Design a protein around this ligand. Structure first.
Ligand SMILES: *Cc1cccc(-c2cccc(C*)c2)c1
Ligand SMILES: *Cc1cccc(-c2cccc(C*)c2)c1
Ligand SMILES: *Cc1cccc(-c2cccc(C*)c2)c1
Ligand SMILES: *Cc1cccc(-c2cccc(C*)c2)c1
Ligand SMILES: *Cc1cccc(-c2cccc(C*)c2)c1
Ligand SMILES: *Cc1cccc(-c2cccc(C*)c2)c1
Lengths: 14, 14, 14, 14, 14, 14
């Protein structure tokens, strides 16, 4: 995946 | 993660 | 992945 | 995860 | 991601 | 993601 999941992944340096 | 990458993930069922 | 990343993933349901 | 999913992730620059 | 890695992901339910 | 899954990811090269 969702937009929310993607934002979290991006913030965690995926 | 980008919105583009998340869309690709959803398209692949990830 | 790191413990920090996995916790972020866990919080987002990844 | 499937080989298809792994290929899709690499195609998206994960 | 490699087939080995994807196989490991399936083994762990990721 | 679980701690077990995160350990498995690291074992597989993450
Ligand atoms: C869509 C998704 C779900 C779980 C984990 C991930 C992931 C894993 C490692 C690196 C990155 C950038 C994303 C994606
Ligand atoms: C969160 C994320 C970042 C980069 C790539 C992907 C992705 C794209 C296509 C397929 C899969 C399994 C994952 C997700
Ligand atoms: C979908 C998702 C949400 C938050 C964090 C992650 C993530 C980030 C870096 C590495 C890994 C394995 C997972 C994914
Ligand atoms: C099935 C799947 C779910 C989440 C993430 C991935 C993946 C695959 C290859 C590379 C990356 C960064 C993430 C696959
Ligand atoms: C797509 C991918 C790449 C490297 C490692 C893994 C993996 C292996 C075991 C468990 C988990 C959650 C992920 C997947
Ligand atoms: C928490 C998680 C779920 C699915 C896939 C992964 C993953 C993908 C690519 C690389 C790594 C290190 C982990 C993580």
């Amino acid at each position: 995946x969702t937009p929310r999941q993607a934002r979290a992944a991006r913030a965690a340096x995926c």
